[PDB]
Amino acid sequence: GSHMNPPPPETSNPNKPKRQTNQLQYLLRVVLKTLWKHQFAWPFQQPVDAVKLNLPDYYKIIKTPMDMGTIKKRLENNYYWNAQECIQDFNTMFTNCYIYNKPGDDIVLMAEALEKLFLQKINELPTEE
Numbered sequence: 001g002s003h004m005n006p007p008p009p010e011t012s013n014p015n016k017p018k019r020q021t022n023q024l025q026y027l028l029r030v031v032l033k034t035l036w037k038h039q040f041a042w043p044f045q046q047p048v049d050a051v052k053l054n055l056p057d058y059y060k061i062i063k064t065p066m067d068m069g070t071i072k073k074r075l076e077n078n079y080y081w082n083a084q085e086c087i088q089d090f091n092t093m094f095t096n097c098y099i100y101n102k103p104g105d106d107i108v109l110m111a112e113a114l115e116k117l118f119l120q121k122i123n124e125l126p127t128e129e
């Protein structure tokens with residue numbers, strides 16, 4: 001894409017140790033699955049294309065971008081060591097939306113609906129075995 005968008009977050013790095021855990025399997029098969037298919041998922045399914053959206057200040061404000069397309073690839077490609085790393089990515093994605101946009105805004109209402117579902121699912125994250 002455009003030279004004016006940053007490179008997306010890392011989804012592959014052989015030097016980073018990786019593990020499958022039951023919690024990570026739940027984050028893919030239950031959490032990501034549930035949120036990905038939601039009516040309001042679409043703005044979150046790929047990195048923000050600030051050029052196409054005409055938001056030249058986006059990556060001036062948001063220095064820790066994250067999106068569910070990146071999280072999906074991280075889960076599918078077993079990038080994580082533990083569930084906390086993945087939960088942090090989700091939280092970063094929501095917080096970026098809340099920081100950049102105004103409380104009224106459609107995108108915020110959408111993020112808040114996804115976050116409510118996320119919280120319900122994470123309260124049932126299974127005990128690590």
Ligand SMILES: CC(=O)N[C@@H](C(=O)NCC#CBr)C(C)C
Binds near residue numbers: 048058096098100
């Ligand atoms: C969710 C987030 O981080 N911010 C959104 C944003 O840049 N503004 C939405 C509007 C306008 Br004009 C992005 C996901 C599209």
